[PDB]
Amino acid sequence: SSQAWQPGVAMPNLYKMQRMLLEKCDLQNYGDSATLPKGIMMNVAKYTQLCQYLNTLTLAVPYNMRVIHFGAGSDKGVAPGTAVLRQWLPTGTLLVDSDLNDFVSDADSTLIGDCATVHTANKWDLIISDMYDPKTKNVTKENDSKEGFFTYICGFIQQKLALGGSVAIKITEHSWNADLYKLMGHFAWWTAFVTNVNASSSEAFLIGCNYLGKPREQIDGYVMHANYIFWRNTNPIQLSSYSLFDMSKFPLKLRGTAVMSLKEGQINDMILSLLSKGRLIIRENNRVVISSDVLVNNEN
Amino acid sequence: AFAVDAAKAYKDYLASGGQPITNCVKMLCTHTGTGQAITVTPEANMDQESFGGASCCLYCRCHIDHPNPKGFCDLKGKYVQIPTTCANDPVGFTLKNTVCTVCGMWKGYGCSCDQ
Ligand SMILES: C[S@@+](CC[C@H](N)C(=O)[O-])C[C@H]1O[C@@H](n2cnc3c(N)ncnc32)[C@H](O)[C@@H]1O
Ligand SMILES: Cn1c(=O)c2[nH]cnc2n(C)c1=O
Ligand code: NA
Ligand code: NA
Ligand SMILES: [Zn+2]
Ligand SMILES: [Zn+2]
């Protein structure tokens, strides 16, 4: 319907409330491709629509904002998604990206290695992940919750996402993790978002909006992934590139959201309310310092 | 007294018919921007395409040292505007052309300071 003019489709709330069993994902338009604007890469279009959707949420956007982007490399050796994120984010936003393999980036700093090697002294206002291993997709085997980089991402959110911050983590039918869905219940709001340019794929971005640091709701992540697939199986999404032609309101507005360093005992219901509205970020405002662990081997 | 001359190699490669470096990252934008050469956000006008800067830098893309004595890059982390007529070779364009230090436009592709 009018969804073709949106950047994509978010999982309707009624699907989130079901108790489905996990089935195979069988998309009506599987294999179809969207017609992209001349010379535009799929991953530029994909990240553009993701950012267009993120514009509709209550994201906290402080001064001195810091954003980290995992899985930012491509088989082309460049970082299209990072370039879109830097376009979208306010000028001056600190942007760090990372991937397993070497790539050329517009980020302020880039770490090359397994994401599990990545450590940061500071907390973050937004975490984006496009990490994906195509070897997880095996339609001949049972589809269990995956660990790997998802285990890292869950721990990283709980240790290094500022309260009030948000995440967008790429999943697919086979690339998913039950604890990550469970962690969506620790945000004021959450959804699974499918970009219109990639509507024929079981890909979605699992978005947690405004981190509360504790469960607002208990989510069974096995059931929730089954609910996500049930939604995808019963709701064909028409491939569409329409929203890419309307960039007039693309830039993320520098809201100037307040940043406060609060101790756990100080986070009352009024603070939680402010966090829930995108009106507050809780973290230190110190320097951004990152590192990657390097395993040292002498093969002589 | 030896250093690899990457700029000359790419120019010579182009002049002998080599295919331009590809996978420069083109951005979506309104194409109603200022048209300046290198900007903090896409600024293409109707005559230009905007690209992620690092992907259009010969030295970035070839994994080699920048000629800036401190190794600084003019393009990485910014957006470069390329005339649409030259967008088949953004790396060659940024290598061969120079930005006006007064108006910020490309010399010969926007800069009117000599009027
Ligand atoms: C779909 S691609 C990334 C596309 C990229 N976002 C873009 O803008 O074009 C998947 C990325 O996730 C990375 N990745 C997969 N597993 C990883 C891991 N354990 N640690 C770090 N990066 C990983 C891959 O190397 C790969 O570059
Ligand atoms: C999403 N999806 C499908 O919809 C589909 N249909 C048939 N094979 C399929 N595969 C492998 C798939 O991943
Ligand atoms: Na945020
Ligand atoms: Na998959
Ligand atoms: Zn460079
Ligand atoms: Zn000039």
Side-chain angles (χ1 to χ4, degrees), chain A:
Chain A
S1 61
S2 61
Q3 293 175 345
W5 286 39
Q6 298 299 320
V9 184
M11 184 173 176
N13 279 346
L14 198 36
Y15 287 102
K16 302 175 186 177
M17 312 184 69
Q18 298 311 300
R19 300 282 305 190
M20 303 314 290
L21 292 169
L22 182 60
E23 297 184 294
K24 168 191 176 59
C25 186
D26 196 321
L27 300 178
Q28 193 181 71
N29 53 0
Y30 185 62
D32 297 357
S33 294
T35 290
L36 299 182
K38 170 170 153 56
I40 295 293
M41 294 169 176
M42 168 60 70
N43 281 347
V44 167
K46 183 188 305 191
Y47 274 70
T48 298
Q49 284 184 331
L50 171 63
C51 289
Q52 286 179 322
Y53 178 70
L54 292 177
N55 280 341
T56 73
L57 308 185
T58 56
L59 298 188
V61 188
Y63 293 107
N64 301 310
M65 188 179 181
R66 51 272 284 272
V67 176
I68 185 156
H69 179 208
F70 296 97
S74 73
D75 61 8
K76 321 157 170 290
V78 294
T82 289
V84 176
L85 292 178
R86 194 165 185 86
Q87 169 186 12
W88 174 61
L89 296 161
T91 298
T93 300
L94 289 176
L95 179 60
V96 170
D97 64 4
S98 189
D99 208 322
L100 183 64
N101 309 297
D102 199 13
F103 63 106
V104 154
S105 179
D106 294 298
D108 297 296
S109 202
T110 298
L111 292 175
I112 305 299
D114 195 288
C115 65
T117 68
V118 168
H119 304 275
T120 72
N122 59 279
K123 294 199 176 184
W124 299 88
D125 305 314
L126 180 59
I127 301 162
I128 307 291
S129 173
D130 197 31
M131 291 189 283
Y132 178 71
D133 179 358
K135 293 170 181 268
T136 71
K137 181 168 184 189
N138 186 337
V139 308
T140 71
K141 299 306 167 188
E142 202 162 309
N143 181 16
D144 291 324
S145 175
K146 306 300 190 298
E147 296 172 314
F149 64 73
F150 284 111
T151 304
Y152 176 79
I153 283 297
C154 288
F156 189 90
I157 290 167
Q158 294 179 277
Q159 298 158 24
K160 298 297 170 166
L161 185 62
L163 304 187
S166 294
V167 309
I169 312 299
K170 198 258 276 307
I171 62 166
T172 67
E173 172 187 9
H174 293 90
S175 188
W176 65 283
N177 172 275
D179 272 327
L180 179 60
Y181 276 109
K182 180 172 179 192
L183 194 52
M184 296 299 105
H186 297 216
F187 293 77
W189 188 83
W190 81 276
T191 188
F193 176 74
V194 175
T195 68
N196 265 340
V197 292
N198 206 17
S200 61
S201 166
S202 66
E203 176 184 278
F205 288 89
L206 192 55
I207 296 165
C209 186
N210 305 130
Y211 184 48
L212 305 178
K214 64 182 184 179
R216 187 191 55 82
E217 154 190 21
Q218 297 293 337
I219 289 172
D220 179 323
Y222 297 89
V223 177
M224 197 60 76
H225 194 56
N227 292 340
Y228 164 74
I229 296 303
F230 180 66
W231 166 48
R232 299 303 315 278
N233 278 345
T234 57
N235 292 255
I237 300 165
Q238 178 189 331
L239 286 158
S240 169
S241 66
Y242 293 173
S243 78
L244 308 179
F245 294 83
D246 182 20
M247 295 293 289
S248 66
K249 298 305 177 200
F250 185 71
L252 181 58
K253 163 182 173 52
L254 180 45
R255 282 150 202 166
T257 309
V259 175
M260 292 172 45
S261 173
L262 289 177
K263 302 180 293 193
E264 241 304 328
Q266 304 182 279
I267 301 173
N268 58 23
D269 296 315
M270 189 270 290
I271 298 292
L272 285 170
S273 174
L274 290 173
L275 295 171
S276 293
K277 293 172 183 165
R279 289 209 278 149
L280 179 62
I281 283 284
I282 297 182
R283 57 162 173 79
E284 114 296 332
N285 231 339
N286 294 332
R287 307 176 313 149
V288 171
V289 178
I290 65 181
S291 67
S292 174
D293 294 343
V294 172
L295 176 59
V296 177
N297 269 320
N298 189 351
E299 320 285 28
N300 274 264

